[PDB]
Structures are given as C-alpha cells and as structure tokens.
Amino acid sequence: VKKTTQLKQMLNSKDLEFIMEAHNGLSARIVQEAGFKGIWGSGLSVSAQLGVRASNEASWTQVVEVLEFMSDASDVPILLDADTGYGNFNNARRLVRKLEDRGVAGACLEDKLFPKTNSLHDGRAQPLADIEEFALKIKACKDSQTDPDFCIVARVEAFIAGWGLDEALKRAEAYRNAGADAILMHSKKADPSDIEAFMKAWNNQGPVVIVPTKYYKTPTDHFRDMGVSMVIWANHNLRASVSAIQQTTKQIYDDQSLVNVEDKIVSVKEIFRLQRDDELVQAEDKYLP
Amino acid sequence: VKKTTQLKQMLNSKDLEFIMEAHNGLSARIVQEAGFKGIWGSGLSVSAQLGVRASNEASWTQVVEVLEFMSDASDVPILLDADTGYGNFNNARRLVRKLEDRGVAGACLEDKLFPKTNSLHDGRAQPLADIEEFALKIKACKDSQTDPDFCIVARVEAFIAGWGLDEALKRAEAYRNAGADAILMHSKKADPSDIEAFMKAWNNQGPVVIVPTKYYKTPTDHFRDMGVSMVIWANHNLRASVSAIQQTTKQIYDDQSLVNVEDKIVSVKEIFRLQRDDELVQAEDKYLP
Amino acid sequence: VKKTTQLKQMLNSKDLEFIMEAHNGLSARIVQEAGFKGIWGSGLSVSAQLGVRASNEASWTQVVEVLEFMSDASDVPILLDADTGYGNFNNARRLVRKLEDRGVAGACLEDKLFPKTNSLHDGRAQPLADIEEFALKIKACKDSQTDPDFCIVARVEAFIAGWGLDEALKRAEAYRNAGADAILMHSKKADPSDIEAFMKAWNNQGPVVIVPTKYYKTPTDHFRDMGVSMVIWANHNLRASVSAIQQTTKQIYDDQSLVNVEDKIVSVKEIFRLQRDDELVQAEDKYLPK
Amino acid sequence: VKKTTQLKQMLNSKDLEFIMEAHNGLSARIVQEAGFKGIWGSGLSVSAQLGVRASNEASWTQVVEVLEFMSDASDVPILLDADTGYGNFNNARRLVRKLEDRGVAGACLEDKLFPKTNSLHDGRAQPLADIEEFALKIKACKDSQTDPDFCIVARVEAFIAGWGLDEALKRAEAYRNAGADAILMHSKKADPSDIEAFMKAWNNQGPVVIVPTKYYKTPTDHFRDMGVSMVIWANHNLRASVSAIQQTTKQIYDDQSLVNVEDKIVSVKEIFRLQRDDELVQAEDKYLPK
C-alpha cells in the first residue's frame, strides 16, 4: 500500500494514531524499525541537524533532499513539516509535486505570515496569513497532486499567534472546506485547554492532529476521549541525539580515550545493519564477477 | 587563522592532536563547543546519517553539501574522509577545490581500488590502487589546491588489505614524497602492533594519523611515546546518536507518552541555542522594521 | 502512457525512430514542441552546457538534477546518456532508480573502463570494461527498476576502442542477453561501414540504436534498410546554440548595441511562452485573492 | 584581481561598462572569450534554460548551483539577478554569502513585493516592498559580505510598478544610502524617457545600471552622455539560443537528416575547446601512469 494511502488511512481511522519525529535517513530507519506507523519530518529537527535555524534558511530543495534520503530509508509514510510551503500557492504546489515524486506521504502547511516582515514584540496577537489566501494555497496543493492520496495537513496557528478559539475554528473550517486532509491544531500552552476547547467546538468536522510536546503530562487517553486523530511526537529523537553527542563528545574530550564510551554506544556493526550493508554484500556477490 | 592552517599546524605540531567525528552541522557544532581543535568528517558517519552505505552511494556533491553545512557550523577544521577521491586524480582535485571553497580544511584519500570491481573472498591480500597512480593522485590534489595550507592526508590501506609493513612503508613513503601532508596508518587489529611496527620503521618521515577504534584500550600515552601526530576518534557521536534515538523511540513507542523521555533529553531551548537562534533574533530586530 | 513505455515502444517499433538531443529544460521543451517523440540526454551536451568536460566531472546527482528539469519540461521520453553508470553496478542501479523517480524514461550505459586509470596512447586497441562485469551491471539495472518499462540501452564501445566486429558482436549479445532493451552501436568512422557490418552480423537479435554524427551524409533510408530501430541526433542543438550565442555575443560586443541582433533572435514573448508563463498567470488568478 | 573587485571597478569606473547575459557555464565562457568584462546572470535566462518560470520556482540553491558552474567557467565577474533575495534580509544575506563563496561577484536585488500575494490587475500602480524593509535588506547584505568588494546592486521597480520619478528617486537614494554599490533603474517603456528623467534627478549620487532591451534603438552614446555607469544586455544569448535550437530541431525533424545543419553549426571540436578538453588531456598525461 502506497505511503500516501498509509498516511491518509491513519488520519481517517477511528483510532488515535502516532507518528514519531525523524530528521535524517538514519533517524527515519530507526523510527520505522521501532514499529511507528508514521514519521514526522520535523521542520525544527531537519533544520537543526543541518546546523541552521528553522526560518527557511535551508532551501526547500535542500529540505526535500533530506526527506528524499528519509523516504528512501523508510516504508512508513513521512508527513513533512513544510512550514508555509516556502512561498505562495505556486511554491507550495511545486513542493507538493516534488515531495510526491520522492515518496513523501504528505505535507503539513501552516497559516503563518511568511517570511517575517517586521519585528514588533508587543502583547498584540500576531497576524497570520489571510484565511482565503491560505485556503486557496491548500486548494492549489490538493488540485496539483497527482497521487489522490497524498495528504495536506493544515496547521492552524490561531492559538499560538494569540487569537482565540473562534479564529482557530474559522481557519480550521476554511482549510478543511478547502480540502485539507486533516487539521493540526496547535498551542503554546503547558496544558491541553486550547486543544480541549477546539475539539469541543469542532464537532468532528475532520481529523485533528496535535503536538503534545508542551503538555506532555496529559494522559494520552484524554486525546482518545476527545476524538483526536493523531499525535505527533515532534522532536524527541533530535533532542535525544544532541544529549548523546554532547555527552559522548565531552567524555572523549576529557579522557582522550574511548574507554568510557565504547560500552555505552551501539557497535559499528549495528551501524552497518542500519545502513543495510548486508543487502549490498549480497548484491555484490550476485552482480560482481 | 584559516581552518586549513589550523589543521596543517595540528598535523605538524610536536603534540599528539585529536579530532572528533561529526556527521552533520549539528554534530559539528557540538564537537566545536566541546573544545576539540578539529573535526573528523567520517565517511562512515556521513553516509549512515543519510541512511545509505559507505560505498559512495551518495554522490560526492551530496557529501560535499553535508560538509558545507558542517563547515558553516564550525570554526575548527574538518578533515573529510573522502574515500579514494570519488574517481581518478581529476575527480579528486575537483573535489579538493570544492572542499576548499566550502571551508573544509583537508581531505583524507585512501589507496583502495575504487570502485569494487570483483567479489573474491579468499584469504589472499586485497589488491590496492597502483602506488604510482595514487601518488600521482596525491600530487594532482596538492598541485590543484589554491590554498597552500589545505591538507591532503593519505590513508595507507596496506595493513587492512592483508599486506605487510614493507608495503605499508613503501606506500607511506611514496605518498609522503608525492606531497601528502600526513599519512593515516590504519589497521584492522584489536591491538596496536601494526601501528607500532610502522612507527618504528617510519623514522618520523612525516606526521602520522591513526584511528584507535579497534584497539581503544591502548593507553593514549603510548601513541605519544611513538610520536604519532594525530588521533581520530572516528565514529562515536554517530554511534551514540543511534543508541539515544533507538532508546528514545522505543520508549515513546511503548509508553505512547513523552513522560519517560522528557527529563532525559536536552530541552528544545537547548536546540535553539545550538542553531544560534538568538543571533537571528538579534538580526531580525536590527534588520526588520 | 508513461514516458518509459513511450520510449520502450519506440525502441521496439517497426519504424526507424528518432530522438533529438537536448541539454536543459528549455531545449527539451523545444524538442518536444517540434514533434520529436523522444529526447537524447547527451553526456557531451549536458556537461558542455555546465561548462565542464564530459568525463564525470559534474556528479551523477548534478546530472540527474539537469535531467529532472528536462523531464519536467517535456511530455516525451528522455533517454539519458549515463556514461558507465558512474561507478559499479550499485552506483548504476541507484542512478536508474533516481532517473525513474524523476520521469526519465531510460538510461544508456557504455562498456568502457571507468574512470580512466592510465594515459598510454600507443596505437593499441583500448581495453574495455570486462564483458561479464558490464553484463551484470545491465542486469542489476534491469533487476532494480520499479517501472517495468524503464529502458536500459547498452552502448558497445568495441569499434571505437579499436576492436573488431567479432568483439562488438560478443559484447552486444552479452548485454542483450543480460536484458538491455536496445544496443547502441557506435563507431568513429565517417562512413556507416561498422554499422552495416554489425547489423548484418546482429541478425535482428534486438533493437539497435545508432548515432550518425560522423557519417551524416548517409541517406537515412539506408538505416531503415538495415533494420535500425532508432537514430540519435546527438548534439546539434548544443552546437547550434553555441554558434548562435557566439555570433550574438560577438555582434553585441562589436556594436555595443542590440540593433543588429534584435531582429535575428526570438522575442521575449516567445521565451515567456516556452516557460509556460501564461499557465502561471492563469493559476495566480485562480489561487490568489483579488 | 578578484572578480568582486573587477565588477566593483566597472560599476565605479568613468566609462560606460557592459555586461552580457549568460545562463549556464557554456554561455558564460563564450561571453568571456568574446571580450566582455562582465556577465549578467539573468533571472529570466537561468529560469528559462531550466524550463521553469522566472517566479522563484527553482530554489535559490538550484539557482546558486547554476551560477557556480558559470563562475567556474569564467574569469570575469558575474552579477546575479537575485530577484528580491528569495525571502527576507536573512535569506538575502545567506544567499550573498553563498554567492561570494562560489566566486559570484555581485547580486542584484529588486524592491518588489515577494512572493505574489494577490492577483488584482486593476489599472492601479502595483505596491512595492516597503522602502525601509528593502533598505535594511541591502544593509544586511552589505553587513554580511566577507569580501569587501562583493557588489550589491539595488534594482528600483518604481517606474515599472506605475509610480513616478519621485518614488523612483526616493527608493534609489534609500538603497544607495543603505550601501548599494549601484542602482539598476528600469522601466517598461520603448523609449529611454524614464532613464533620462531619473539620471537628471539622480545627480550622480551613485553608479546607475540600466537594461535597454525595450529602448534598444537608443544610441549607446546617449547613455554615456547621461553618465550611465553600466549597460546590461539582458537576454539576447538566451533568445539567440532559442532561435537556433528551434530552427535546428525543426530542420532535422523535417529532413530526418543532419545534412542541412552540419554546415550551419559549430563543429564538435569547438565544443571540446569550449569545454577545455585539452587541459584534461594534458592533465591525464601528467597524472596518470603510462
């Protein structure tokens, strides 16, 4: 079954689904091997592994190539955190076609104003992309896909930006009506109130995706009770990697020896297995004289 | 001081120097922050993070771009594990110019036959690149660099391939005479005998670089006693990352919650700091109205 | 009707087919609008447009990227001249998988030693890739396609390398038996004698592709008579482009004016048409608020 | 003499300078061999050769990559038409840093709204990027160059956008004050009236670059009289290339022969020369065993 279809089924299923963040081919393979039915191509993680910020410093094609390697290394669908589509509807649909061709299952586009044009840090709510413009962007992507199952998730930034439930609902409905396959409802809060308020008002007009990072103490059954469709574990592999690399690097730096890390890290043979080195060995014996 | 010069000084200094493996921009930054004077752009790690094998599946330009991101994220020199130069002398010197332009400090080229043309698994020693050909490849790289301090490290595979000290010495001397800035003498052994045998016979004709991965129990002072110039901690950040990602992924998969990983990984704010998010914030306040 | 299938039908059709060289997205669209049923992604042309030599200087992914834009800009199949596959069978199949993914219809691989290991130029015949190695490379490529109709064309370098017909025949049969969709038989003669000799000895064991650049005075019907499946017009758009650019640049350099070129070149409106600018104009009208 | 410096001296020289458009490594080398002291990395040409529209469809890194091959194939400075910098000041400076690193000598940024947010076509004058935003973008670019001589040219869209001379002057002064090495003043008229009006009001506050594509009948000496620093021949190699490719492809399509093109296009030997194939031949002789 196509990865696009796999993701689409997840978004539309009656069960709470989960997708795990991965930021490179290696990361993607590990997530797949763990049993996750889906991968979250975190915009934060992809940019951070590259050493750059998540402000579209890396080009959209550079992001796409990272995801191409991720897609090549996984059988489960990857939902790409594509920010706002890297431009207008045209850049978004072009991105969609490229993701589609590389095997990526869907793209998550957010209704934030892009790029940042001013710098005002008052208490005001932050203006977002015009609703009709973003709805038309969603429509353009849906209209441009060649795989009817490719998914477009519309991330509503109303709560994050300082607006309220009414703005969140209006945007969610506009994007869902524009054809979004799911709505990712997000919040900056350390509790699930925004999510709760939205789900109550949403009346299940379509699948809802959430990112519990800040309110991670919330019992997962509470999301099920609310009919949430999918949970995204957004950036934990990247955060775990940094801890390990920082710890491993300092230890070696301090010891000028490998004695205190050798027993704490996977073997090199485990690395070869993750690269599927044996498939190549077999291939070499078959295709080389 | 230029990164090339930084690396060159390290190779020629009277002290045992160390460089730590890094496989992406994030990794490179962490190694730098830890205090390492140099970074080892591991061929194994770069390919593995991409989810592919270390058999030049990723193109040389794809490797170069990974290193471009690494170089952009570090001030210390990166010595790239460039396998055999991805082709003949011409591909090697072209690679050298691109690495040079991206800020990479040096390239390590090995005298293995590339690409693998046959598959015979007998006990015979494995044939390597013709000595004159490889020496000429080294010469071409040295002759093509526009930065006189860019470094070319010649990795001698004689011991690994099954040949002995005499072949290792002959190759080392030929490459050193061809202008190699240092000789990386490697072995597959779980003890330092090959390294010991070579250093005894080498009579310090030039800097020697080693990779203690398999004989990591060896006391580091023993390398100093032998006059080794540099130690490469080859792949430990990649191996540490995989352990963390595998552990973190399984935990979340099992718990369907973040409660058991949140306290074990770096915060998201630590990720922003590694991306130098504050420099951008400052820049936005200065360059945006 | 996938491009792969289109190219495959052309190779297996009963008529002499023709593919025109193109080296970028722009020339690919022009070749298509001209009515050509196929495009030749020339190694000489693609490397030349980039300003590098045709010796694997640009990486295979940079080449694939050029081909991606060409594929996007054309509805007809593109057959890429992929040298030897940029490495061994593994590099070759990964290349095929990437070309498939981007809409490229086929790849032409040649059996020469790669990369160059020595510079001896004595009159001797140049050694080629080991017949079995290359045959297995072809098989590895066929075995790894996800699209059954993707085409692998095997170019035999025997005549060019100095070997005779026997060796040209041996290699071709070997590559055909390995699964090549067609054999590209080439020679460095200014006459079609190597081709006539091979076609006679071949005995229609498979579609044969030729490049008549050097023996261009040979009537095309002669190729139909020999039962040649396809002809490649290998590099004339690149050569024509260079002539035009040199003359135009020279004219402007000398005149310090555009007066003597403006009437000899396409208008800017034609460029916009070739870019399909109007489609975007239409899309903005539909997808951007008023 | 770095390319950056070369381009900068041209912008600040007392003579009317000229840069020829090129869109790939091949045309860049041709422009150079013709004697042009500079190259115009046209946004129209680069996007067109790729077969896409000039609306930021190809990513900035794909554009930079094309420019990298162009830089490698030329010894004279290339001024890249970088639209608006592909985003805000941050995307613009990262672009400048990458262009510097690859040998590109300068970047031309324009003050139009990017990307397009709406499709209203009422007669109204089109709004542009906020003058302060763009000025700060220019400054951010100047502030981030590692090479002091890298050039930032600011293209003013006021006349084209429907605004008058006052606004064209306001923007230009603003961008010049921010540190632009030159101002590219453009108009969509078939006469140089907008340029004459601006040059008169400008009062030589800085080098001015123009593109006389639309008013090409205007004597070039007239631009010298106005004190114009540089002229850009914006897209004639691309236009000439398209003419040549269409004719050549058509000729071959109709004749199913190369007979009527072989004598009208450059020989293959000229392509090898342009690729500098002989240098590689010489290098192999020296670096490959016998």
Instruction: Report how far residue B96's alpha carbon sits from residue C170's, in angstroms, rounded to the nearest whole number.
Output: 40
Which CATH number do you get for residue C53?
3.20.20.60
Q: Which residue of C has its CA nearest to A94?
A: C72
Residue type, B53: R
Residue A158 CA to residue A184 CA, distance in Å, equals: 11
Tokens of A59: 């080009």
Q: Determine contact, residues C23/C48, Cβ cutoff 8 Å.
A: yes
Phi, psi (deg, nearest 5) at residue A79: -105, 115
As to burial, measured by CB atoms within 10 angstroms (0-12 exposed, 13-18 middle, 19+ buried), residue C158 is buried
Q: How far is D22 from chain B (nearest CA, A)?
A: 22
SS3 D20: strand
Tell me the residue type at B269: K
Q: Rounded CA gap, D193 and A176, in Å? A: 51
Q: In this structure, what token pair is assigned to residue C2?
A: 């996938």
What residues pair up with A128 in beta bridges, in sequence order? A112
> Taking Cα atoms as reference points, which of A92, A171, A90, A154 lies closest to residue D119?
A90
- Measured in degrees and rounded to the nearest 5, phi and psi for residue A106 equal -170, 175
Cα D249 off chain centre by: 28
- For chain D, helix (H) and strand (E) counts, in that order, are 13, 8
d(CA C107, CA C181): 10
Instruction: Find out whether D207 and D201 touch, Cβ atoms under 8 Å.
Output: no
Number of H helices, E strands in chain B: 12, 8
Of C60, C90, C118, the CB nearest to B59: C60
B78's enclosing H/E stretch is strand B78-81
Cα-Cα-Cα-Cα torsion C131, C135, C138, C143, nearest 10 degrees, comes to -160
Task: Express the helix, strand and coil content of chain C in percent, nearest 5 each.
Answer: 50, 15, 40
3-state secondary structure of A102: helix
Q: Which experiment gave this structure?
A: X-ray
Cα separation, C96 vs B63, in Å, equals 20
| Per-residue tokens: A198 | 């939205």
Mapping DSSP to helix (H, G, I), strand (E, B) and coil, where does residue D80 land?
strand
Asked if residues B6 and B13 have their Cβ atoms less than 8 Å apart, the reply is no
Residues B5, B8, B14, B16, CA torsion sign: positive
The beta-carbon neighbor of D283 closest among B90, B133, B289 is B90
∠D11-D65-B27 over CA atoms, to 5°? 115
Closest chain B C-alpha to D24 CA, distance in angstroms = 18
Residue type, B37: K
Give the three-state DSSP class for D232.
Answer: strand
Q: CB–CB of C146/C97 below 8 Å?
A: yes
Asked if B142 has any chain D CB less than 8 Å from its own CB, the reply is: no
Could you say which DSSP state residue D57 is in? -
Beta bridge partners of D289: none
Nearest to D136 by CA among D109, D157, D101, D98: D109
What is the number of other CB atoms lying within 10 angstroms of the CB of residue B146? 9
The range of the structural domain enclosing residue B74 comes to 1-289
Whether A119 has its CB under 8 Å from any CB of chain D: the answer is no
- Strand bridging mode D39-41 / B39-41: unpaired
CA B101 to each of CA B106, B160, D121, D232: distance values in angstroms, whole numbers, following the listed order: 11, 32, 45, 29
Cα–Cα distance, D163 to B244 (Å, whole number)? 59
Amino acid at B108: C
Gap between the Cα atoms of A9 and B176, Å rounded: 61
Resolution attained, angstroms: 2.0
Residue tagged 């032409």 (tokens):
C108
Cβ neighbourhood burial of A269 (10 Å; 0-12, 13-18, 19+):
exposed
CA distance B275 to A45: 10
* Residue A219 structure tokens: 């019992």
Place of tokens 């004698």: C193
Distance, CA of C106 to CA of C10 (rounded, Å) = 12
- Cα(C195)–Cα(C188) distance, integer angstroms: 11
Probe site for chain A from B66, B245, B282 (most A CB atoms < 10 A)? B245
Which of A53, A56, A57, A59 has the highest number of chain D CBs within 10 A, making it the mutation to test binding with D? A59
Residue holding tokens 């005298």?
A: B111
Cα-based distances in Å from A99 to A70, A147, A230: 11, 11, 21
Contacts for D1 with CB less than 8 Å, ≥ 6 apart? none
Return all residues near D290 (Cβ < 8 A) that are at least 6 apart: C118, C119, C120
Q: Does the distance separating the beta carbons of C61 and B59 come in below 8 Å?
A: yes
Distance, in Å, from the CA atom of C187 to the CA atom of C204, rounded to the nearest integer, reads 19
C-alpha A277/C-alpha A274 separation (Å) is 8
SS3 sequence, A222-282? HHHHCCCCEEEECCHHHHHHHHHHHHHHHHHHHHCCCCCCHHHCCCHHHHHHHCCHHHHHH
Q: Subunits with at least 3 CB pairs below 8 A relative to chain D?
A: A, B, C
Measured between CB atoms, does C63 come within 8 Å of chain D? Answer: no
With a CB cutoff of 8 Å and minimum separation 6, the contacts of B232 are B18, B19, B21, B40, B79, B184, B209, B210, B211
Contacts of C168 (CB under 8 A, 6+ apart): C156, C158, C159, C185, C194, C198
- Pull the structure tokens for residue D252: 């071959």
Structure tokens that stand for D42 in this block: 């046209």
Contact A46, A82 (CB under 8 A): no
Chain C CB within 8 Å of residue B91 CB: yes
- Angle between the N-to-C axes of helices C60-72 and D60-72, in degrees from 0 to 180, rounded to the nearest 10: 120
Residue A84 backbone class (left: φ over 0; alpha: ψ -120 to 50; beta: rest)? alpha
Q: Is residue B109 helix, strand or coil?
A: strand
D175-209 burial: b if 16+ Cβ within 10 Å, else e = bbebbbbbbbbbbeeeebebbebbbeebeeebbbb
Q: Which residues pair with B112 in a beta bridge?
A: B128
**Beta strand pairing call for A106-110 and A151-156:** parallel
What b/e string do you get for C170-199 counting C-beta neighbours within 10 Å, with b at 16 or more?
ebbbbbbebbbbbbbbbbeeeebebbebbb
The answer to whether the Cβ–Cβ distance between B90 and C117 falls below 8 Å is no
Q: Distance between CA atoms of B42 and A74, rounded to whole angstroms?
A: 23
Question: Per the structure block, which two tokens stand in for D97?
Answer: 């840093």
Pairing status of strand A182-185 against strand A208-210: parallel
A246 CB near a chain D CB, below 8 Å? Answer: no
**What does residue A73 show for φ and ψ, rounded to 5 degrees?**
-95, 15
Does A220 lie at the interface with B, CB-CB under 8 angstroms? Answer: yes
Size of interface B-D (CB pairs under 8 A): 49
**Whether A3 contacts A105, CB under 8 Å:** yes
Q: What is the dihedral of CA C274, C275, C278, C283, to 10 degrees?
A: 150
Q: How many angstroms away from the CA of B51 is the closest CA of chain A?
A: 4
Q: Does D224 contact C at CB distance below 8 Å? A: no
